[PDB]
Amino acid sequence: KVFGRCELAAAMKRHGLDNYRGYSLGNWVCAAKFESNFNTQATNRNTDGSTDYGILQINSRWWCNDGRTPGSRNLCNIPCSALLSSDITASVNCAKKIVSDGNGMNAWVAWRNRCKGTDVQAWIRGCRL
Numbered sequence: 001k002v003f004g005r006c007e008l009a010a011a012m013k014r015h016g017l018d019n020y021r022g023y024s025l026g027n028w029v030c031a032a033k034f035e036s037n038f039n040t041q042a043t044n045r046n047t048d049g050s051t052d053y054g055i056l057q058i059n060s061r062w063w064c065n066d067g068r069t070p071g072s073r074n075l076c077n078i079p080c081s082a083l084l085s086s087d088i089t090a091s092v093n094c095a096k097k098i099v100s101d102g103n104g105m106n107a108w109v110a111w112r113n114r115c116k117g118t119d120v121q122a123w124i125r126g127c128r129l
């Protein structure tokens, strides 16, 4: 599924991502924009042979099992395919663990490079939340 900006903002809030670990909803929408372009089916191979899955490009290296990432962990206790669902619950649950891991949203390199310190409120501007 390709979400709209305000539709994704609404689904993130309903799943308790808004202000989770102090990160305003605009920060999560901005990360999703540049990770996946709001596409729940987005997958990208990393050079180390791990894969990033879903709206928030969660990495098989640590967080999900795709069965092809040697030496990896599955810390969110899920198949990486569940991160590709039109329902974002599993992606949200697992992003809660990632952002609690100690480096906050810096774990999303696109967040750091393209969202951090920007006017992230623009991402939820005009949205009926």
Ligand code: NA
Residues within 6 Å of the ligand: 060, 061, 062, 063, 064, 065, 066, 067, 069, 072, 073, 074
């Ligand atoms: Na893994």
